[PDB]
């Protein structure tokens, strides 16, 4: 009858940047997604294989809850099967995905006046990534033919790129705060519903 | 020890231009964003604008937009602020501030820690 | 113009505690923002005093602490001397206006 911990992952302070996404596990609990669907804040609520309405009548084995900012214009990069420079390189979505994900507008919290510049996201990588996978190894890239260790001088780059967020960019250029779901829904005693 | 000095402030007839700076020193001078503020004589201070650490962006207070211009030099450890076309009410005793180092909650907080001395300029004839 | 509400002037004698409340709007400090203080002497710039609700800084006495609740918040002087005759200032920041504002300032009086 434990009521399910889903404020200290809302209405947490700071989220973590796109590149190290922060993964929070959900056991035993109980989950009510009924608030969270009429909040009428978020902007975005796409359910894949499972219809939000249906979402009180049954449950899972565990839910996983990972959370990060990204940019206005790369929201639509969340989602199986697409192509881009976060998708790529930061955050990949398996094809046979099952769950929900959530987005909503939060220039409010996360720009000031100034610029600020404690948001990161992976820009350059030899390949990409698997699914549900992380890499914070910032080992210096090696671009073009000539070997460079330690330094940054010519066709040497820093992979991290520091996002710039000020309260007066466009639509397009305002931080979104993303939270994505995920349900497994096979085997095992279910710990999840009400 | 953290110490701004600043200067370039006197009495000018209206409609000029002036040019006036602070020099820092004793701290990693491209690391920090800068702001400028101004306090006029009787009433509570006042911010003016803001530039970030490496001069790409900035932003300027609504009341002199279009007659403030903010500037940049990291390497000489300088950053200058120059005033087109001055009025009756520009006459304070302005000040150059450090942006605040930690915050704790939120990431729209701003703070200023370390304070210059300003210097007096007003405008009459 | 300064947009947050602080009274005028605080009186007060040496031994008891004053207390100075500073007043915003929905936008300014509703919102969630914090509050600072400041002190300025007569005749020297402005030096921080109160970052954060409460949170000292270095090389400040106990004798100053602050809360912020609701739309409002109080700064507090305990066992008042003859040393802290200056103006006090109020500073957060708003999110319609889009800029750091100031408070009115109080100046503590002593007696």
């Known amino acids: 009858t434990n009521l399910c911990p889903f404020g200290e992952v809302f209405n947490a302070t700071r989220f973590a940047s796109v590149y190290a996404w922060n993964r929070k596990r959900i056991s035993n609990c109980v989950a009510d997604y009924s608030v969270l669907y009429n909040s009428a804040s978020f902007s975005t609520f796409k359910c894949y294989g499972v219809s939000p309405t249906k979402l009180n009548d049954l449950c899972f084995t565990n839910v996983y809850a990972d959370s990060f900012v990204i940019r206005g214009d790369e929201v639509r990069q969340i989602a199986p099967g697409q192509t881009g420079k976060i998708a790529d390189y930061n955050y990949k979505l398996p094809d046979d995905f099952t769950g929900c994900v959530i987005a909503w507008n939060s220039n409010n919290l996360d720009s000031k006046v100034g610029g600020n510049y404690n948001y990161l996201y992976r820009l350059f990588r030899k390949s990409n990534l698997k699914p549900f996978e992380r890499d914070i190894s910032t080992e210096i890239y090696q671009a073009g033919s000539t070997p460079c260790n330690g330094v940054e001088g010519f066709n040497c780059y820093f992979p991290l790129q520091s996002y710039g967020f000020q309260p007066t960019n466009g639509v397009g250029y305002q931080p979104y705060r993303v939270v994505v779901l995920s349900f497994e829904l096979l085997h095992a005693p279910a710990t999840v519903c009400g | 020890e953290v110490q701004l000095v600043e200067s370039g402030g006197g009495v000018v007839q209206p409609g000029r231009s002036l040019r006036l700076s602070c020099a820092a020193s004793?701290?990693?001078?491209?690391?920090?964003?800068m702001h400028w503020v101004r306090q006029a004589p009787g009433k509570g201070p006042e911010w003016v604008a803001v530039?970030?650490?490496?001069?790409?962006?900035?932003h300027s207070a609504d009341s002199v937009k279009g007659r403030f211009t903010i500037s940049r030099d990291n390497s000489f450890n300088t950053l200058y602020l120059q005033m087109n076309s001055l009025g009756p009410e520009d006459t304070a005793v302005y000040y150059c501030?450090?942006?605040?180092?930690?915050?704790?909650?939120?990431?729209?907080?701003?703070?200023?820690?370390?304070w210059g001395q300003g210097t007096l300029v007003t405008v009459s004839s | 113009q300064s947009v947050l509400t602080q009274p005028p002037s605080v009186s007060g004698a040496p031994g008891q505690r004053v207390t100075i409340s500073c007043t915003g709007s929905?936008?300014?400090?509703?919102?969630?923002?914090?509050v600072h203080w400041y002190q300025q002497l007569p005749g020297r710039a402005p030096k921080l005093l109160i970052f954060?609700?409460?949170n000292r800084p270095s090389g400040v006495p106990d004798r100053f602490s602050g809360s912020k609740s609701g739309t409002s918040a109080s700064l507090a002087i305990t066992g008042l001397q003859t040393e802290d005759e200056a103006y006090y200032y109020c500073?957060?920041?708003?999110?319609?206006?889009?800029?750091?504002?100031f408070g009115g300032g109080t100046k503590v009086t002593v007696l």
């Open positions: 501030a450090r942006d605040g180092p930690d915050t704790s909650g939120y990431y729209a907080n701003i703070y200023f820690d370390f």
């Open positions: 004793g701290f990693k001078f491209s690391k920090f964003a």
């Open positions: 530039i970030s650490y490496d001069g790409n962006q900035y």
């Open positions: 929905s936008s300014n400090i509703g919102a969630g923002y914090d």
């Open positions: 954060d609700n409460n």
């Open positions: 500073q957060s920041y708003d999110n319609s206006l889009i800029l750091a504002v």
